[PDB]
Amino acid sequence: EISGAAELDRTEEYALGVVGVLESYIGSINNITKQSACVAMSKLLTELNSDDIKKLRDNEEPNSPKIRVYNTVISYIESNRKNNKQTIHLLKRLPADVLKKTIKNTLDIHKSITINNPK
């Protein structure tokens, strides 16, 4: 093991905080308001495209169980394009207990496309 000082470490700016807010909310480590979590998630989708999910989904059988969870994501992405207002409303009518699951399924996709390769 070694540590030749900080190599690139091209830290632009803590890499935004959109994800940071959600992590704190679902992390239960702090007291983030559902409003701050939903709005944040909205900027998150901007990255995850519907067509992108289809690809990841295709990796499964055309009748697999993961089809429902992945399919659900499409409803959120497509909705954002139709009206970002509905995206926040959907999470509002849903309980924070189910909400946390929705946020996870969203971050789970982001981690799949994890670019770069930092130590």
**Are the CB atoms for 106 and 52 separated by under 8 Å?**
no
Residue 7 is part of a domain; what is its CATH number? 1.20.120.1350
CA distance 107 to 23: 9
In this structure, what token pair is assigned to residue 80? 């954002």
The residue assigned the tokens 């994800």 is 19
Enclosing domain of residue 69: 1-119
In this structure, what token pair is assigned to residue 57? 């989904």
Residue in 62, 55, 47 with CA at minimum distance from that of residue 15: 47
Split into its structural domains, the chain has a count of 1
CA distance 92 to 33: 12
